[PDB]
Design an enzyme around this catalytic site. Structure first.
Site, short mmCIF file in Angstrom:
data_model
loop_
_atom_site.label_atom_id
_atom_site.label_comp_id
_atom_site.label_asym_id
_atom_site.label_seq_id
_atom_site.Cartn_x
_atom_site.Cartn_y
_atom_site.Cartn_z
N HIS A 173 0.81 -1.21 0.00
CA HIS A 173 0.00 0.00 0.00
C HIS A 173 0.84 1.27 0.00
O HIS A 173 0.29 2.36 -0.18
CB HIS A 173 -1.08 -0.04 1.10
CG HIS A 173 -0.62 0.43 2.45
ND1 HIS A 173 -0.30 -0.44 3.48
CD2 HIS A 173 -0.49 1.67 2.97
CE1 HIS A 173 0.01 0.25 4.56
NE2 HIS A 173 -0.08 1.54 4.27
N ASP A 206 -0.04 -7.54 1.76
CA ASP A 206 0.42 -6.14 1.74
C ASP A 206 1.94 -6.12 1.85
O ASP A 206 2.53 -5.84 2.91
CB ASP A 206 -0.25 -5.35 2.86
CG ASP A 206 0.01 -3.86 2.76
OD1 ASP A 206 0.52 -3.38 1.71
OD2 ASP A 206 -0.30 -3.15 3.75
N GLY A 263 2.20 6.76 8.56
CA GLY A 263 3.58 7.14 8.36
C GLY A 263 4.59 6.09 8.77
O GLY A 263 5.73 6.15 8.32
N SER A 315 3.78 2.93 8.08
CA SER A 315 3.44 1.88 7.12
C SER A 315 4.66 1.46 6.32
O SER A 315 5.46 2.30 5.87
CB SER A 315 2.37 2.38 6.15
OG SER A 315 1.13 2.51 6.82
N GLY A 316 4.77 0.15 6.11
CA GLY A 316 5.86 -0.43 5.36
C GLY A 316 7.10 -0.72 6.18
O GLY A 316 7.99 -1.43 5.70
#
Length: 223
Positions: A40, A84, A175, A177-178
């Site tokens: 995402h 994801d 923020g 994320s990942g």
């Protein structure tokens, strides 16, 4: 990261910032040429920033390297966030050192209760917005799959797990994320989604990296 602490400069040397003119997501260096992040977080024109602490100040240990290619998981579903995960190749190999280092992939899942390190530059508030300049960190345990599925009925797949605190107050956030969830020296999770941040009975949901190691290794070897 809500309810965490200042990591300390370069204490998480596999943590990267993905930059498209500004920080927008985290990632994890898995070898000198490759970063793993969340699907995402995909966009074109990514620059990977390694060796970062204060993302707003050049402090002297950074490496900025453009991505040459991004590969989103073949089964990524943006509606459910199932699968994801994405891989990002660096246009030139990172120079590994004490402050820029890869994180090992897991060989198996981690047990409920195992303590993990979650990190990122995301929002530090559970109701407002405040974005930090230095890297933030959170120790958080893997939660039982049953408590994870009880919190999010109908929405947890075998490719997700929960970590954190059902009582609230400590969570990853927008923020982050990942970015990484590291347990026992292995990258077990990727910051994926959740209901708000640090809310009661809505813990963080993370991509279950161990399910993807075969795809990661095959994809890197072929690209």
């Amino acid at each position: 990261i809500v309810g965490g602490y200042t990591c300390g400069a370069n204490t998480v040397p596999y943590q990267v910032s993905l930059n498209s003119g500004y920080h927008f997501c985290g990632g994890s260096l898995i070898n000198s040429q490759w970063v793993v992040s969340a699907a995402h977080c995909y966009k074109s024109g990514i620059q990977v920033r390694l060796g970062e602490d204060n993302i707003n100040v050049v402090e002297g240990n950074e490496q900025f390297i453009s991505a040459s290619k991004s590969i989103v998981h073949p089964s990524y579903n943006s509606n459910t966030l199932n699968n994801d995960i994405m891989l990002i190749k660096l246009k030139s190999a990172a120079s590994l050192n004490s402050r820029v280092a890869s994180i090992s992939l897991p060989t198996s899942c981690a047990s409920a209760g195992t303590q993990c390190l979650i990190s990122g530059w995301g929002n530090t508030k559970s109701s407002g917005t405040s974005y930090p300049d230095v890297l933030k960190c959170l120790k958080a345990p893997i939660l039982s799959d049953s408590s994870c599925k009880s919190a999010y009925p109908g929405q947890i797949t075998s490719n997700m797990f929960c970590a954190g605190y059902l009582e609230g107050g400590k969570d990853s956030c927008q923020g982050d994320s990942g970015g990484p969830v590291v347990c026992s020296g292995k990258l077990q999770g990727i910051v994926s989604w959740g209901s708000g941040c640090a809310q009661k009975n809505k813990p963080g949901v993370y991509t279950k990296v161990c399910n993807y190691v075969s795809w990661i290794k095959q994809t890197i070897a072929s690209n």
